[PDB]
């Protein structure tokens, strides 16, 4: 007994917040338990009740530390495997990353308690979702952002699936936070009205999820094929292995050359500069056009700037019928949002010589234009997003065009190894496909290579960590979703209104 005495202790709540914070990771990874997200948000909402601003900030920081150290720890695997640093240094780096990610949850909890101290429906339903949206935007914007582990992505297959195509995964985050706050308030106050309101709010989008915003045109059906080279990441960036990788990809492509129409290779499938492999690319494009196919592969390009400086762009070249290959062609995609510490190392003067982990091969990339024309191959338009860029919903939507028939994503998940990072990335890609209502053609070296339907459901998939070829027929779709039409503008208007109302009520509370 005496639960009230123990629960009203800051030290105990810190330990209890760690468990509830880590409980949220059961919704993104292959665990895929969407009630866990609601439970974790309920814990975060409840454990900050009746606390001073500093204690609430500590509770939020511990919750974020659990969440981002129990499901972002797969970064440590990549760091240790492909970087020469001691184990204490690696664990310090992953702990520091978790703490940095948890700062924006501690800030959320602190501001929420500072402005709305008393546990009320207002705080748990209006102020909390708006402030949570603001802090998530800050986390995804500052220092190029790391918008990972957003609970809306857990609703890719759930009751709130249909909310994504209308307003987005960020609005799904908003609704999840609101419902979970109402549930936490009902649990804390032992009341039934917040529970009923939360049930109504959560069950409202279930009929909404049946709306079909896309027309599955079958007249433009193709036979896309994707190749998993299963190239070892350690040997990926070498000299002798380049010929072996090219031979493997060519031999995998040759049977498909003639039967398939949209052969795709993973990110950085060709591990050499585009200019160096010019005759090979020319011959490959010629023989692909002879048999009537296309090859949207990935390569590394080093263009010359106006200042005679070589800028390295992570690129997606296009070859075959419907898109003749040329070094000056505009039918290419340059990666815009580079991955921190892996593609653009900040402070190269000190960080790069500090350890071999910072001085990874093929680094110091150059960002491409934010908005780029869609890739054309065999008469169809593909929206490209290299690896990490897929999770950026706003950038993907901005690059999206009404003429887009497929969403293209190529990644190299061999860094993460056997962990949950590739699965979380795949889930975020599925959420993007659901939001834009376009079929997704995701190709990976070792990670999850699959074709995602317009509703986010997996149409085809191949086992992870193998050298397989995913050959299937995918039908394009036409039509603009409300999310594609608008963006985050409706969500930002809604959260601005809610925040303004909450601030006015807090000031008027006096
Ligand atoms: C006030 C300062 C506070 C600082 C707070 C941060 C401190 C901690 C920072 C260190 C810990 C994070 C380290 C993450 C990078 C580890 C190395 C990963 C390598 C990598 O980036 O993958 C590349 C691209 O990723 C891909 O193409 C696919 C993977 C994309 C997902 C990557 C997820 C991990 C990155 C998370 C970084 C978050 C930083 C947020 C600040 C490989 O791609 P490639 O095959 O073409 O090889 C070409 C490579 N040269």
Short mmCIF file of C-alpha atoms in Angstrom, two decimals, residues 38-394:
data_model
loop_
_atom_site.label_atom_id
_atom_site.label_comp_id
_atom_site.label_asym_id
_atom_site.label_seq_id
_atom_site.Cartn_x
_atom_site.Cartn_y
_atom_site.Cartn_z
CA UNK A 38 0.01 5.61 -26.29
CA UNK A 39 1.26 4.04 -23.05
CA UNK A 40 4.60 5.86 -23.27
CA UNK A 41 2.95 9.21 -23.99
CA UNK A 42 0.55 8.59 -21.09
CA UNK A 43 3.54 8.00 -18.84
CA UNK A 44 5.26 11.17 -20.02
CA UNK A 45 2.08 13.20 -19.52
CA UNK A 46 1.28 11.75 -16.09
CA UNK A 47 4.73 11.80 -14.49
CA UNK A 48 5.04 15.58 -15.01
CA UNK A 49 1.87 16.33 -13.02
CA UNK A 50 2.07 18.45 -9.86
CA UNK A 51 5.79 19.16 -10.28
CA UNK A 52 7.96 22.25 -10.26
CA UNK A 53 9.33 23.32 -13.66
CA UNK A 54 12.83 21.98 -12.98
CA UNK A 55 11.61 18.62 -11.68
CA UNK A 56 9.26 18.32 -14.66
CA UNK A 57 12.14 19.13 -17.01
CA UNK A 58 14.19 16.39 -15.34
CA UNK A 59 11.28 13.95 -15.77
CA UNK A 60 11.01 14.84 -19.45
CA UNK A 61 14.76 14.51 -19.92
CA UNK A 62 14.75 11.04 -18.36
CA UNK A 63 11.78 10.02 -20.53
CA UNK A 64 13.59 11.23 -23.64
CA UNK A 65 16.79 9.53 -22.53
CA UNK A 66 14.96 6.22 -22.25
CA UNK A 67 13.21 6.69 -25.59
CA UNK A 68 16.36 7.69 -27.50
CA UNK A 69 18.71 5.27 -25.74
CA UNK A 70 16.38 2.32 -26.21
CA UNK A 71 15.98 2.44 -29.98
CA UNK A 72 18.63 4.87 -31.16
CA UNK A 73 21.39 2.68 -29.69
CA UNK A 74 21.85 1.08 -33.12
CA UNK A 75 24.00 4.11 -33.99
CA UNK A 76 26.56 2.64 -31.59
CA UNK A 77 26.71 -0.53 -33.70
CA UNK A 78 27.65 1.43 -36.82
CA UNK A 79 30.08 3.66 -34.91
CA UNK A 80 31.93 0.73 -33.32
CA UNK A 81 31.98 -1.35 -36.50
CA UNK A 82 33.07 1.33 -38.99
CA UNK A 83 35.00 3.71 -36.74
CA UNK A 84 38.24 3.26 -34.86
CA UNK A 85 37.53 4.46 -31.32
CA UNK A 86 37.52 2.82 -27.88
CA UNK A 87 34.36 1.27 -26.49
CA UNK A 88 34.09 3.85 -23.69
CA UNK A 89 34.29 6.54 -26.38
CA UNK A 90 31.55 4.84 -28.41
CA UNK A 91 29.22 4.48 -25.43
CA UNK A 92 29.94 8.09 -24.47
CA UNK A 93 29.03 9.20 -28.00
CA UNK A 94 25.74 7.28 -28.03
CA UNK A 95 24.86 8.53 -24.54
CA UNK A 96 25.61 12.11 -25.62
CA UNK A 97 23.40 11.66 -28.69
CA UNK A 98 20.59 10.36 -26.49
CA UNK A 99 21.01 13.29 -24.10
CA UNK A 100 20.96 15.80 -26.96
CA UNK A 101 17.78 14.23 -28.30
CA UNK A 102 16.25 14.22 -24.79
CA UNK A 103 16.97 17.92 -24.27
CA UNK A 104 14.00 18.76 -26.52
CA UNK A 105 11.70 16.57 -24.42
CA UNK A 106 12.99 18.06 -21.18
CA UNK A 107 12.33 21.52 -22.61
CA UNK A 108 8.81 20.46 -23.58
CA UNK A 109 8.02 19.15 -20.10
CA UNK A 110 9.58 22.16 -18.40
CA UNK A 111 7.70 24.73 -20.46
CA UNK A 112 4.46 22.77 -20.13
CA UNK A 113 4.71 22.72 -16.34
CA UNK A 114 5.90 26.34 -16.16
CA UNK A 115 2.97 27.72 -18.16
CA UNK A 116 0.23 25.24 -17.16
CA UNK A 117 1.12 23.85 -13.72
CA UNK A 118 -2.27 22.52 -12.63
CA UNK A 119 -3.27 19.20 -14.17
CA UNK A 120 -6.27 20.12 -16.32
CA UNK A 121 -7.96 19.17 -19.57
CA UNK A 122 -6.57 22.38 -21.08
CA UNK A 123 -2.98 21.41 -20.29
CA UNK A 124 -3.37 17.78 -21.36
CA UNK A 125 -5.35 18.42 -24.56
CA UNK A 126 -4.50 21.87 -26.00
CA UNK A 127 -1.18 23.08 -24.60
CA UNK A 128 0.58 19.71 -24.60
CA UNK A 129 0.01 18.79 -28.29
CA UNK A 130 0.99 22.28 -29.49
CA UNK A 131 4.14 22.47 -27.37
CA UNK A 132 5.01 18.90 -28.36
CA UNK A 133 4.68 19.86 -32.03
CA UNK A 134 6.88 22.92 -31.47
CA UNK A 135 9.59 20.90 -29.71
CA UNK A 136 9.48 18.17 -32.36
CA UNK A 137 9.90 20.83 -35.05
CA UNK A 138 12.85 22.28 -33.14
CA UNK A 139 14.44 18.83 -32.86
CA UNK A 140 13.92 18.20 -36.57
CA UNK A 141 15.15 21.66 -37.59
CA UNK A 142 18.13 22.68 -35.45
CA UNK A 143 21.60 21.47 -36.51
CA UNK A 144 20.01 20.05 -39.70
CA UNK A 145 17.63 18.11 -37.45
CA UNK A 146 17.26 14.46 -36.46
CA UNK A 147 13.49 13.86 -36.66
CA UNK A 148 13.64 10.24 -35.54
CA UNK A 149 11.18 8.26 -33.40
CA UNK A 150 8.00 10.23 -34.04
CA UNK A 151 5.04 8.26 -32.72
CA UNK A 152 2.91 8.98 -35.80
CA UNK A 153 5.10 6.62 -37.81
CA UNK A 154 3.87 3.88 -35.47
CA UNK A 155 0.36 4.39 -36.90
CA UNK A 156 1.39 3.20 -40.37
CA UNK A 157 -0.82 0.15 -39.74
CA UNK A 158 -3.34 1.22 -37.12
CA UNK A 159 -6.57 3.12 -36.43
CA UNK A 160 -4.93 6.48 -37.22
CA UNK A 161 -3.66 5.39 -40.64
CA UNK A 162 -6.15 7.57 -42.51
CA UNK A 163 -5.14 10.78 -40.76
CA UNK A 164 -1.75 10.82 -42.51
CA UNK A 165 -2.93 11.45 -46.12
CA UNK A 166 -5.04 14.40 -44.96
CA UNK A 167 -2.73 16.28 -42.59
CA UNK A 168 0.46 14.25 -42.10
CA UNK A 169 2.49 12.24 -39.63
CA UNK A 170 2.99 15.41 -37.59
CA UNK A 171 -0.78 15.74 -37.20
CA UNK A 172 -0.83 12.07 -36.22
CA UNK A 173 1.71 13.00 -33.53
CA UNK A 174 -0.62 15.82 -32.49
CA UNK A 175 -3.64 13.52 -32.19
CA UNK A 176 -1.67 10.81 -30.37
CA UNK A 177 -0.36 13.33 -27.84
CA UNK A 178 -3.85 14.77 -27.30
CA UNK A 179 -5.50 11.37 -26.83
CA UNK A 180 -2.72 10.12 -24.56
CA UNK A 181 -2.88 13.28 -22.46
CA UNK A 182 -6.63 12.85 -22.05
CA UNK A 183 -6.12 9.21 -21.03
CA UNK A 184 -3.42 10.20 -18.53
CA UNK A 185 -5.67 12.89 -17.07
CA UNK A 186 -8.52 10.39 -16.72
CA UNK A 187 -6.21 7.90 -15.01
CA UNK A 188 -4.74 10.48 -12.61
CA UNK A 189 -8.06 12.11 -11.68
CA UNK A 190 -9.94 8.77 -11.71
CA UNK A 191 -12.51 10.38 -14.02
CA UNK A 192 -14.44 8.94 -16.96
CA UNK A 193 -15.16 12.03 -19.08
CA UNK A 194 -11.56 12.47 -20.36
CA UNK A 195 -11.51 8.74 -21.12
CA UNK A 196 -14.72 9.03 -23.16
CA UNK A 197 -13.42 12.09 -25.02
CA UNK A 198 -10.13 10.32 -25.80
CA UNK A 199 -11.98 7.23 -27.03
CA UNK A 200 -14.15 9.37 -29.31
CA UNK A 201 -11.13 11.25 -30.68
CA UNK A 202 -9.19 8.04 -31.31
CA UNK A 203 -12.13 6.22 -32.93
CA UNK A 204 -13.10 9.15 -35.17
CA UNK A 205 -10.44 8.56 -37.90
CA UNK A 206 -11.30 4.86 -38.23
CA UNK A 207 -14.05 5.49 -40.84
CA UNK A 208 -11.77 8.17 -42.30
CA UNK A 209 -9.04 5.61 -43.02
CA UNK A 210 -11.19 4.03 -45.77
CA UNK A 211 -10.98 7.07 -48.06
CA UNK A 212 -9.08 6.32 -51.28
CA UNK A 213 -7.35 9.41 -52.68
CA UNK A 214 -5.64 7.57 -55.56
CA UNK A 215 -6.72 6.00 -58.84
CA UNK A 216 -4.82 2.76 -59.59
CA UNK A 217 -4.22 3.17 -63.32
CA UNK A 218 -3.44 -0.30 -64.73
CA UNK A 219 -2.66 0.87 -68.27
CA UNK A 220 0.79 2.10 -67.16
CA UNK A 221 1.76 -1.04 -65.24
CA UNK A 222 5.47 -1.89 -65.42
CA UNK A 223 7.71 -4.65 -64.03
CA UNK A 224 10.14 -2.94 -61.67
CA UNK A 225 13.17 -4.95 -60.54
CA UNK A 226 15.55 -4.09 -57.72
CA UNK A 227 18.91 -5.67 -56.91
CA UNK A 228 20.47 -6.21 -53.48
CA UNK A 229 24.21 -6.48 -54.03
CA UNK A 230 24.85 -7.30 -50.35
CA UNK A 231 28.19 -5.53 -50.71
CA UNK A 232 30.21 -5.51 -47.46
CA UNK A 233 30.29 -1.96 -46.13
CA UNK A 234 33.92 -2.19 -45.02
CA UNK A 235 34.93 -3.30 -48.53
CA UNK A 236 32.38 -1.02 -50.22
CA UNK A 237 34.82 1.90 -50.57
CA UNK A 238 37.93 0.30 -52.07
CA UNK A 239 39.65 -0.14 -55.44
CA UNK A 240 39.72 -3.87 -56.16
CA UNK A 241 36.19 -4.36 -54.85
CA UNK A 242 34.85 -1.80 -57.35
CA UNK A 243 35.25 -4.21 -60.28
CA UNK A 244 33.69 -7.04 -58.27
CA UNK A 245 30.68 -4.89 -57.34
CA UNK A 246 30.22 -3.75 -60.94
CA UNK A 247 30.41 -7.35 -62.15
CA UNK A 248 27.89 -8.51 -59.54
CA UNK A 249 25.42 -5.75 -60.39
CA UNK A 250 25.82 -6.29 -64.14
CA UNK A 251 25.30 -10.05 -63.83
CA UNK A 252 22.22 -9.52 -61.67
CA UNK A 253 20.84 -6.97 -64.14
CA UNK A 254 21.50 -8.92 -67.35
CA UNK A 255 18.62 -11.45 -67.04
CA UNK A 256 16.29 -8.58 -66.10
CA UNK A 257 17.48 -6.46 -69.05
CA UNK A 258 14.61 -6.93 -71.48
CA UNK A 259 11.93 -8.26 -69.14
CA UNK A 260 11.97 -5.45 -66.57
CA UNK A 261 11.52 -1.76 -67.37
CA UNK A 262 12.68 0.11 -64.23
CA UNK A 263 15.74 -1.76 -62.95
CA UNK A 264 17.03 -0.01 -59.82
CA UNK A 265 20.34 -0.27 -57.97
CA UNK A 266 20.86 0.75 -54.31
CA UNK A 267 22.42 3.97 -53.04
CA UNK A 268 26.03 4.43 -54.18
CA UNK A 269 25.89 1.10 -56.01
CA UNK A 270 28.77 2.28 -58.19
CA UNK A 271 31.54 3.17 -55.74
CA UNK A 272 33.54 5.29 -58.21
CA UNK A 273 33.28 8.80 -59.60
CA UNK A 274 30.77 9.25 -62.40
CA UNK A 275 33.38 10.66 -64.79
CA UNK A 276 35.73 7.71 -64.19
CA UNK A 277 33.11 5.10 -65.17
CA UNK A 278 31.93 7.07 -68.21
CA UNK A 279 32.60 4.38 -70.88
CA UNK A 280 31.05 1.68 -68.70
CA UNK A 281 27.96 3.82 -68.16
CA UNK A 282 27.75 4.58 -71.89
CA UNK A 283 27.96 0.89 -72.82
CA UNK A 284 25.42 -0.07 -70.15
CA UNK A 285 22.98 2.61 -71.31
CA UNK A 286 23.40 1.51 -74.92
CA UNK A 287 22.73 -2.14 -74.19
CA UNK A 288 19.80 -1.23 -71.93
CA UNK A 289 18.21 0.93 -74.64
CA UNK A 290 18.83 -1.81 -77.21
CA UNK A 291 16.67 -4.24 -75.22
CA UNK A 292 14.23 -1.51 -74.15
CA UNK A 293 14.67 -1.01 -70.41
CA UNK A 294 15.84 1.63 -67.94
CA UNK A 295 18.25 1.72 -64.99
CA UNK A 296 17.82 4.27 -62.21
CA UNK A 297 21.02 3.53 -60.29
CA UNK A 298 23.02 5.45 -57.69
CA UNK A 299 26.50 6.86 -58.10
CA UNK A 300 28.96 9.40 -56.67
CA UNK A 301 29.53 12.50 -58.81
CA UNK A 302 32.17 15.24 -58.46
CA UNK A 303 31.13 18.26 -60.52
CA UNK A 304 33.24 21.39 -61.05
CA UNK A 305 31.94 24.60 -59.49
CA UNK A 306 32.39 28.13 -60.83
CA UNK A 307 35.37 28.56 -58.49
CA UNK A 308 37.05 25.48 -60.05
CA UNK A 309 36.33 23.52 -56.85
CA UNK A 310 35.24 19.88 -57.04
CA UNK A 311 31.93 19.40 -55.21
CA UNK A 312 30.96 15.80 -54.46
CA UNK A 313 27.25 15.02 -54.75
CA UNK A 314 25.51 11.81 -53.77
CA UNK A 315 23.71 11.19 -57.03
CA UNK A 316 21.04 9.09 -58.75
CA UNK A 317 21.88 8.74 -62.43
CA UNK A 318 19.33 7.42 -64.92
CA UNK A 319 20.16 5.18 -67.88
CA UNK A 320 18.27 3.21 -70.49
CA UNK A 321 15.28 3.77 -72.74
CA UNK A 322 13.41 7.02 -72.23
CA UNK A 323 16.44 8.75 -70.68
CA UNK A 324 19.72 8.62 -72.65
CA UNK A 325 22.77 8.99 -70.44
CA UNK A 326 24.97 12.08 -70.69
CA UNK A 327 27.24 13.74 -68.15
CA UNK A 328 25.48 17.10 -68.65
CA UNK A 329 21.94 15.70 -68.42
CA UNK A 330 19.50 17.19 -65.93
CA UNK A 331 17.90 13.77 -65.34
CA UNK A 332 19.76 13.26 -62.07
CA UNK A 333 19.12 13.78 -58.36
CA UNK A 334 21.74 15.20 -55.99
CA UNK A 335 21.30 14.51 -52.28
CA UNK A 336 20.35 17.69 -50.41
CA UNK A 337 20.04 16.78 -46.71
CA UNK A 338 23.34 15.14 -45.87
CA UNK A 339 23.67 12.84 -42.86
CA UNK A 340 25.53 14.47 -39.94
CA UNK A 341 28.96 13.00 -39.09
CA UNK A 342 28.80 10.72 -42.15
CA UNK A 343 28.45 12.92 -45.22
CA UNK A 344 29.30 16.40 -43.90
CA UNK A 345 31.58 16.52 -40.86
CA UNK A 346 31.32 19.87 -39.03
CA UNK A 347 34.59 21.57 -38.10
CA UNK A 348 36.79 19.48 -40.39
CA UNK A 349 39.87 21.29 -39.06
CA UNK A 350 39.74 19.46 -35.71
CA UNK A 351 37.00 16.81 -35.94
CA UNK A 352 38.41 15.00 -38.98
CA UNK A 353 41.94 14.41 -37.53
CA UNK A 354 40.44 13.66 -34.10
CA UNK A 355 39.54 10.04 -34.91
CA UNK A 356 39.16 7.78 -37.96
CA UNK A 357 35.40 7.67 -37.32
CA UNK A 358 35.03 11.31 -38.37
CA UNK A 359 37.31 10.79 -41.40
CA UNK A 360 35.12 8.25 -43.15
CA UNK A 361 35.79 7.63 -46.85
CA UNK A 362 33.66 9.65 -49.29
CA UNK A 363 32.84 12.48 -46.88
CA UNK A 364 32.53 16.27 -47.16
CA UNK A 365 29.67 16.01 -49.63
CA UNK A 366 27.97 19.07 -51.12
CA UNK A 367 24.25 19.68 -50.71
CA UNK A 368 22.16 19.71 -53.86
CA UNK A 369 19.22 21.99 -54.63
CA UNK A 370 16.33 21.69 -52.19
CA UNK A 371 13.77 21.29 -55.00
CA UNK A 372 14.83 19.18 -57.98
CA UNK A 373 12.97 17.95 -61.06
CA UNK A 374 11.59 14.42 -60.83
CA UNK A 375 13.59 11.69 -62.53
CA UNK A 376 12.30 10.39 -65.86
CA UNK A 377 12.88 6.80 -66.97
CA UNK A 378 10.98 4.94 -69.72
CA UNK A 379 8.34 7.67 -69.83
CA UNK A 380 7.48 7.67 -66.11
CA UNK A 381 8.38 10.20 -63.43
CA UNK A 382 10.00 9.20 -60.13
CA UNK A 383 10.47 11.35 -57.04
CA UNK A 384 13.93 10.63 -55.65
CA UNK A 385 15.03 10.63 -52.02
CA UNK A 386 18.46 9.24 -51.12
CA UNK A 387 18.35 7.20 -47.91
CA UNK A 388 17.98 9.61 -44.98
CA UNK A 389 16.06 12.14 -47.09
CA UNK A 390 12.94 9.95 -47.15
CA UNK A 391 12.09 10.63 -43.50
CA UNK A 392 11.86 14.38 -44.25
CA UNK A 393 8.17 14.57 -45.10
CA UNK A 394 8.14 18.26 -45.98
#
